[PDB]
Design a protein around this ligand. Structure first.
Ligand code: SF4
Ligand code: SF4
Ligand code: SF4
Lengths: 366, 318, 149, 147, 89
């Protein structure tokens, strides 16, 4: 006697074969069914188009992570500001989707529509640019970058509050979330529960702070904080939305004239106009796009905070044009191992709410 | 004979409105969400009701989970019960308010039947229970309004009401909280869908769905209208009827027309507003978690109204 | 005039059939539906208010309870000396009569039906007892199916 | 094909239902990866197309939109949903993955398991391109389609 | 009263001959109660005023109680899950 969750429309998409054993209110026997292999057979530059494919909503977190680790292995400002801006923009796009998705999953539609309008403003900022590369970035933004983010940053802080205005003063959502979704902080650490799912439960360990990457050190970010539940994980992400918007404002301000990718010819490739004057640039251009570059023989793993948890690329390089083995530390897979424990004894309609709060995407998991 | 045209027109109208109301909820909610509902299917968007309800019948689609012909029978009873409730409005019926109570008693029977897969049927029993709770609530309220009145005929209540939703504002608020709880925010979540079961609504299958939603919205227009006669303003500008409203009628001239219309336009306005409340309550909405709806009514709303029975006659004998 | 009204003894004809159908029906659910229809025929016979009382309560609640119980509780169903034993007693029924016919040969060669007046008033002792009888109704199960700690 | 055929151009009855069909078309959402995310931008931009959820049964909808990567394991499930759909049914293949990143864990094409009416390339294709595919299915239901 | 009497009879017959079943019984009894109510109602109308109408209503209330009692009796019987005691019965 079980409930086979899905098999296509559980409440949104995914796919799901969450064979939920039940007895009223019991045993989550999931089944999460070769990117790991395909990446091996692909050059470092080629793995960029593959990278964004995993977590589609916060694709840039995937890009940054991978690009960073590859940078560290290889040893490669106004470009680092663009990343901090884009990482947070993709964090706003990824936070919007999840808040709404979960607001839709158990409860009503309405917030989801609003979520999507601001998303359409970011996808427009995504079509305008395309973006991240191992040297830096594909190309420069535009003169219409500065004045456009402000129009989005002004007509967002209000909008961020209407979604909150409805949810903070939770109608049924308070009765449905408040106790549900048991996450002991010790046991979250024992189950390796990534977080923003971990920081709501009380523990204050986030990669952006513990191990700050490019331009995140120089930017002023606030302290988002009670009891490991769906409601408090849901609300922390709403505060995270406003602090992200404050990073976007703070990073839009600190944007002067600069180059976009690492000048070392063996890495990147920024000629575009120089293809007509230099010989070393074509011999290089042809070679980078045919063979590529061979990194140093050794292991590397650089972690980056995604809005869906802990993103890390474990790249073993055997001095080849391609990575010898690229194992992506899956935030959504790590978080899901705590479902059989968190949803144990919980309700069936709440078993949908307990899943949306985890902030999962199947593309990242598998 | 003459009555055949009087019944026909009315029912054709009722059905017309039922069909359009689907498109209404659509457009209204889209306005809330900053979007537009059925943009083309019109002109206006009038032909989204028809061209859709025509498309489910043309599909013309059955699993042993529900007995052969009992599978497409609850679809018939849900509509047949809704048919009676509208027809029982037009006619006077000397004992009318406990004729309205006979139909909402008999409507629910189709839910217990609907699924009678083991577990899906279990899910049906939940809704069966859920409905049963608020159906008891409404009766408690019907009864309170009869306490104030004593005359069981619906008409006497409709006509009796220079006040209606002034004393009974709290009661009416509780009526809408139950009137919606019988079908919209909870039932939308009470559907559950675990897994597939039952898509958007009760395994539709086509074209039984056409009579289902034509018992849903139909028994939302009648469910709100019913609330209107009992609790709300069941026709006319009463402040004017107190201030000497006759002026406009007496100075109008003579035709025996527009006087019969005024009231219908007022009731139309009432149901329109109640429907809008229904439009937004579906928007604002959150969870239901069946046990978290059983707890709400049995332990709270039900004993709240009980205490009211221990006030109405006491303050009547005061 | 109005012959159909005169022939509405059609109620009895229907009823006998509808109950012979509650018996014949395999299995319970159809029989439940049947009890509803039979009660509906009874209501149609009350137009010949007790229909509306009968429809609101019997069909309204009882029937709902029978349908809600059958769908909840799996139960169901469809000569070994003791089974033969009742039939043994009926062959004695025939014998009594057969012995008797041979015995006689010994010397031979505003307000609408109301009800409230008497219930709330004269029979208030009963109305009070009916509040107490309903008490048990709800309490009995709460002390038969509970299993509390 | 044939032009103004029969005694009197009617013809009317079939086209009446077909016009009603094409614009009221019921889509069954089969969300897999990124393509399901673009297909949601589609609903934000939908007005007449609006019907998703009819996707959950799935016996209530006519238009099967396969959006995302079809894993070889997912292959027998996608087969049973299309078979568990009602008879006048259409299929829209959304995405490079559902049309034709070719791996060892994914089906090389969605047409291999279920017959495909309209193909929409892109990675993921823009919302308007799915609308164009929706119109490619609209003009197809109308008997419009040819070379 | 003619109708109600016939209904009562049928109900009684169905009661015993039991028809093995055991499930039908409660339905049958409820039917019997209805039948009687019918007989009395005709008699009340024959007589006039609150003579039988009240007793009628009572049996109705009482019938409700009986169905409650019977249904909880069934819920009580039919103990759930397959756990065994040890030699005591
Ligand atoms: S490189 Fe060109 S050919 Fe390859 S995917 Fe990019 S677009 Fe297609
Ligand atoms: S590829 Fe080599 S030989 Fe061919 S022209 Fe270029 S650099 Fe000189
Ligand atoms: S097509 Fe591109 S968009 Fe759809 S799943 Fe495949 S990878 Fe994603």
């Amino acid at each position: 006697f079980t409930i086979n969750f899905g098999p296509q429309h559980p409440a949104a998409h995914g796919v799901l074969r969450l064979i939920l054993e039940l007895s009223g209110e019991x045993x989550x026997x999931x089944x999460x069914x070769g990117t790991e292999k395909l990446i091996e057979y692909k050059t470092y530059m080629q793995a960029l188009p593959y990278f964004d494919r995993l977590d589609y909503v916060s694709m840039m977190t995937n890009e940054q992570v991978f690009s960073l680790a590859v940078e560290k292995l290889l040893n490669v400002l106004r470009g680092k500001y663009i990343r901090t801006m884009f990482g947070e923009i993709t964090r706003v796009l990824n936070h919007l989707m999840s808040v709404c998705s979960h607001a839709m999953d158990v409860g009503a539609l309405t917030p989801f529509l609003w979520g999507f309008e601001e998303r359409e403003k970011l996808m427009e900022f995504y079509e305008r640019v395309s973006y991240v590369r191992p040297g830096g970035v594909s190309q420069d933004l535009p003169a219409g970058l500065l004045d456009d983010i402000y129009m989005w940053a002004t007509q967002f802080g209000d909008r961020l509050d209407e979604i909150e205005e409805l949810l903070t003063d939770n109608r049924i959502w308070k009765l449905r979330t408040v106790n549900i979704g048991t996450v002991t902080a010790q046991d979250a650490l024992n189950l390796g529960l990534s977080g923003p799912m971990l920081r709501g439960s009380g523990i204050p360990f986030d990669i952006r702070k513990n191990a700050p990457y490019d331009a995140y050190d120089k930017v002023d970010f606030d302290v988002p904080v009670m009891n490991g539940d769906c409601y408090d994980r849901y609300l922390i992400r709403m505060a995270e939305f406003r602090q992200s918007l404050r990073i976007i404002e703070q990073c839009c301000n600190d944007m002067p004239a600069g180059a976009v990718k690492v000048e070392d010819f063996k890495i990147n490739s920024p000629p575009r106009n120089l293809m007509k004057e230099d010989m070393e640039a074509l011999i290089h251009h042809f070679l980078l796009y045919t063979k590529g570059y061979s990194v140093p023989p050794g292991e590397t793993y650089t972690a980056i905070e995604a809005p869906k948890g802990e993103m890390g690329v474990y790249v073993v390089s055997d001095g080849s044009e391609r990575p010898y083995k690229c194992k992506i530390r899956a935030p959504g897979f790590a978080h899901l191992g705590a479902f059989d424990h968190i949803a144990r004894g919980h309700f069936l309609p709440d078993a949908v709410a307990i899943i949306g709060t985890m902030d999962l995407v199947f593309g990242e998991v598998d | 004979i003459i009555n055949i045209v009087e019944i026909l027109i009315f029912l054709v109208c009722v059905l017309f409105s039922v069909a359009y109301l689907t498109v209404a909820e659509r457009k209204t909610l889209a306005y809330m969400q900053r979007r537009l509902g059925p943009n083309f299917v019109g002109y206006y968007g009038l032909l989204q009701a028809f061209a859709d309800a025509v498309k489910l019948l043309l599909x013309x689609x059955x699993x042993x989970x529900x007995x052969x012909x009992x599978x497409x029978x609850x679809x018939x009873x849900x509509x047949x019960x809704x048919x009676x409730x509208x027809x029982x409005x037009x006619x006077x019926x000397x004992x009318x308010x406990x004729x309205x109570x006979x139909x909402x008693x008999x409507x629910x029977x189709x839910x217990x039947x609907x699924x009678x897969x083991x577990x899906s049927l279990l899910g049906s029993i939940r809704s069966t229970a859920q409905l049963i709770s608020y159906e008891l609530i409404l009766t408690s309220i019907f009864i309170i309004i009869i306490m104030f009145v004593s005359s069981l005929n619906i008409t006497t209540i409709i006509x009796x009401x220079x006040x209606x939703x002034x004393x009974x504002x709290x009661x009416x608020x509780x009526f809408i909280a139950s009137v919606a709880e019988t079908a919209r925010p909870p039932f939308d979540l009470t559907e559950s869908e675990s897994e597939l079961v039952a898509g958007y609504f009760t395994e539709x299958x086509x074209x039984x769905x056409v009579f289902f939603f034509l018992a849903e919205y139909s028994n939302i227009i009648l469910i709100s209208a019913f609330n209107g006669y009992l609790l709300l303003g069941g026709x006319x500008x009463x402040x004017x009827x107190x201030x000497x409203x006759x002026x406009x009628x007496x100075x109008x001239x003579x035709x025996x027309x527009x006087x019969g219309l005024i009231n219908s336009s007022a009731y139309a306005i009432k149901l329109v507003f109640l429907m809008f409340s229904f439009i937004w309550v579906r928007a604002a909405x959150x969870x239901x978690x069946x046990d978290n709806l059983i707890n709400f009514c049995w332990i709270i709303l039900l004993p709240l109204l009980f205490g009211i029975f221990l006030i109405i006659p006491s303050t009547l004998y005061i | 005039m109005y012959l159909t009204y005169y022939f509405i003894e059609i109620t009895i004809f229907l009823a006998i059939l509808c109950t012979i159908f509650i018996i014949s029906a395999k299995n319970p659910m159809v029989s439940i539906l049947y009890m509803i229809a039979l009660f509906v025929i009874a209501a149609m016979y009350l137009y010949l208010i007790f229909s509306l009382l009968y429809i609101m309560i019997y069909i309204g609640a009882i029937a709902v309870l029978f349908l809600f119980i059958i769908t909840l509780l799996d139960i169901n169903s469809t000569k070994s000396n003791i089974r033969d034993l009742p039939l043994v007693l009926i062959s004695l029924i025939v014998l009594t009569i057969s012995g008797l016919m041979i015995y006689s040969n010994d010397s031979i060669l505003t307000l609408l039906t109301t009800i409230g007046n008497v219930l709330l008033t004269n029979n208030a002792f009963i109305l009070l007892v009916l509040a107490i009888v309903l008490l048990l109704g709800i309490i009995g199960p709460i002390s038969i199916t509970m299993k509390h700690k | 094909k044939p032009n103004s055929a029969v005694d009197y151009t009617l013809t009317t009855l079939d086209a009446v239902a077909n016009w009603a069909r094409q614009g009221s078309f019921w889509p069954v959402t089969f969300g897999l990866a990124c393509c399901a995310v673009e297909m949601m931008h589609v609903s934000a931009p939908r007005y007449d197309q609006d019907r998703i959820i009819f996707r959950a049964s799935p016996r209530q909808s006519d238009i099967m939109i396969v959006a995302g990567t079809l894993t070889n394991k997912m292959a027998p499930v996608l087969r049973q949903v299309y078979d568990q759909m009602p008879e006048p049914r259409w299929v829209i293949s959304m995405g490079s993955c559902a049309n034709g990143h070719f791996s060892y864990s994914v089906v090389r094409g969605c047409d291999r398991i279920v017959p495909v009416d309209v193909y929409v390339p892109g990675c993921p294709p823009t919302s308007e391109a799915l609308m164009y595919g929706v119109f490619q299915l609209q003009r197809k239901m109308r008997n419009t389609k040819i070379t | 009263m003619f109708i109600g009497t016939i209904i009562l009879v049928l109900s009684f017959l169905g009661f015993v001959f039991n028809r093995r079943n055991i499930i039908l019984a409660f339905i049958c009894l409820e039917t019997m109660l209805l039948g009687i109510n019918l007989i009395l109602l005709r008699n009340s109308v024959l007589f006039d005023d609150i003579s039988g109408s009240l007793f009628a209503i009572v049996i109705i209330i009482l019938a409700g109680v009986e169905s409650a009692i019977g249904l909880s009796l069934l819920v009580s019987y039919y103990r759930l899950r397959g756990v065994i005691n040890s030699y005591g019965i």
